[PDB]
Amino acid sequence: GPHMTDPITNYKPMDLQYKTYAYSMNELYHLKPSLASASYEEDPLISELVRSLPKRKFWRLRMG
Amino acid sequence: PHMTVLSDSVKHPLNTAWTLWYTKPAVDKSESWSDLLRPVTSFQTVEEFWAIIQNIPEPHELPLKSDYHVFRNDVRPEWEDEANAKGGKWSFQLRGAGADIDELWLRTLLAVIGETIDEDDSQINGVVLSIRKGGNKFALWTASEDKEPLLRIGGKFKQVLALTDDGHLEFFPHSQPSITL
Ligand SMILES: C[n+]1cn([C@@H]2O[C@H](COP(=O)(O)OP(=O)(O)OP(=O)(O)O)[C@@H](O)[C@H]2O)c2nc(N)[nH]c(=O)c21
């Protein structure tokens, strides 16, 4: 039974020695794109990445 | 409130690059693991991650016997890979309705790419979602069997999965579990 209010969602380790980049779940969720940034204002470089993903047939979604 | 993948509401680097892999469901009795496992894409920023996960199927759409794997770049999601060969996996099997699969998977991915549950001296090499008839599974793949680091990771993983009972998380060395939490 996960909920956004779970305290794990705000946790991030501090005083790291090896890793520079760590983010809490909430920090990452705040960086979710807006509808515009995922469509009609999408960064063209991100659009190229999306266009490189497989076509739907790759996943074999009908194979039970 | 719940976290969702799709936007039905300065780049930010990740500690490592990651590659998303898929295990396809077989269409016949001839296809092997080596035929079915394919890399999909790589990413190394938060922005790239979100663009990928918003444009691939959600867990609830995936067919029986498929897997998603998200592993640090240059690590294959295989027990034979040099980086995994001395390790194992913490695995949780969601028995029952499992209506929370999409959110559980999202939370797990965020915690993995965000480096929040791994040790600073990294153990986690990747994470695997497995779609199976008896209940879908979530697994963290580790580079070692070191007990105290594994127990720290395991306790944090239980929180990510919103588990409150004991006995739900099992560690399987890549060689019946050797640790249960
Ligand atoms: C992760 N993995 C899976 N396989 C193949 O995939 C099979 C299933 O591997 P699995 O680890 O997903 O088992 P699971 O318990 O989920 O399977 P289930 O019984 O259908 O529920 C193994 O027998 C191997 O044949 C693998 N085969 C190799 N060589 N290396 C791997 O790392 C590997």
Domains of chain B plus CATH, in order, are: 1-181 (3.30.760.10)
Per the listing, tokens 């956004």 go with A4
DSSP sequence for B134-145: T-EEEEEEES--
Question: What does the DSSP 8-state code read for residue A8?
Answer: G
For residue A31, CA distances in Å to A26, A34, B46, B105, B171 come to: 9, 9, 7, 17, 32
Tokens of A63: 């194979």
Helix, strand and coil in chain A, % to nearest 5:
35, 0, 65
Question: CA angle at residue B20 from B15 to B34, to 5 degrees?
Answer: 130
Comparing alpha-carbon positions, the chain B residue that sits nearest to A16 is B120
Give the dihedral sign, CA B88/B94/B98/B103. negative
Rounded CA-CA distance B45/B13 in Å is 4
For residue B116, CA distances in Å to A10, A37, B16, B26, B176 come to: 10, 26, 13, 35, 28
Rounded to the nearest whole angstrom, what is the distance from the C-alpha of residue B52 to the centroid of ligand 1?
Answer: 25
Rounded CA-CA distance B70/B17 in Å is 10
The residue range of the domain holding A59 is: 1-64
Rounded CA-CA distance B125/B112 in Å is 9
Rounded CA-CA distance B62/B159 in Å is 25
Residue B155 forms beta bridges with which residues?
A: none
Q: Please give the resolution of this entry in Å, rounded to 1 decimal.
A: 1.4
- Do the beta carbons of residue B141 and residue B91 sit within 8 Å? no
Q: Which residues of A4-17 are buried (b: 16+ CB within 10 A; e: fewer)?
A: eeeebbebbbeeee
**Ligand 1 atom showing the smallest separation from residue B33 Cα:** 5
Which technique was the structure solved with, according to the deposited record? Answer: X-ray
Question: What does the DSSP 8-state code read for residue B157?
Answer: H
Please give, rounded to a whole number of angstroms, the shortest distance from the CA of B83 to a CA of chain A.
18
- Do the beta carbons of residue B131 and residue B68 sit within 8 Å? no
| Residue A57 with chain B: CB contacts under 8 Å | none
Q: Are the Cβ atoms of A58 and B22 closer than 8 angstroms?
A: yes
Number of folded domains that form chain A: 1
DSSP sequence for B37-94: EEEEEEEEEHHHHHHHHTTS--GGGPPTT-EEEEEETT--SSTTSTTTTT-EEEEEEE
- The identity of residue A42, as a single letter, is E
Q: Whose Cα sits closest to atom 25 in ligand 1? A: B33
Q: Are the Cβ atoms of B63 and A64 closer than 8 angstroms?
A: yes
Question: What does the DSSP 8-state code read for residue B109?
Answer: H
Tokens of B46: 């938060």
- Do the beta carbons of residue B143 and residue B125 sit within 8 Å? yes
Is any ligand 1 atom within 6 A of the Cβ of residue B136?
no
Please give, rounded to a whole number of angstroms, the shortest distance from the CA of B49 to a CA of chain A.
9
| Residue A35 with chain B: CB contacts under 8 Å | 7, 9
Per the listing, tokens 């690059």 go with B17
Which residue of A13, A24, A33 is in closest CB contact with B50? A33
Is any ligand 1 atom within 6 A of the Cβ of residue B165?
no
- Do the beta carbons of residue A34 and residue B51 sit within 8 Å? no
Rounded CA-CA distance A21/B68 in Å is 24
Interchain CB contacts (distance < 8 Å): A and B = 146
To test the pocket of ligand 1, the residue of B23, B24, B33 to mutate (highest count of ligand atoms within 8 Å of its CB) is B33
Q: Which of B147, B144, B136, B46 is nearest to B97 (CA)?
A: B136
Number of H helices, E strands in chain B: 4, 8
Strands of the sheet containing B13-23, edge to edge, are B37-45, B13-23, B67-72, B124-130, B136-142, B88-94, B169-173, B179-180
Query: In this structure, which long-range contacts are made by residues B73-78, counting pairs with CB atoms below 8 Å and at least 24 apart in sequence?
Result: B73/B16, B73/B17, B73/B18, B73/B19, B73/B42, B73/B44, B75/B125, B75/B126, B76/B21, B77/B21, B77/B37, B77/B126, B77/B128, B77/B141, B78/B37
Question: What does the DSSP 8-state code read for residue B169?
Answer: E
- The identity of residue B159, as a single letter, is Q
Q: Quick one: CA torsion of B104, B114, B72, B159, rounded to 10 degrees? A: -40
Tokens of B19: 């590659």
Q: Which of A28, A39, A49 to mutate to test the interface with B (most CBs of B within 10 A)?
A: A28
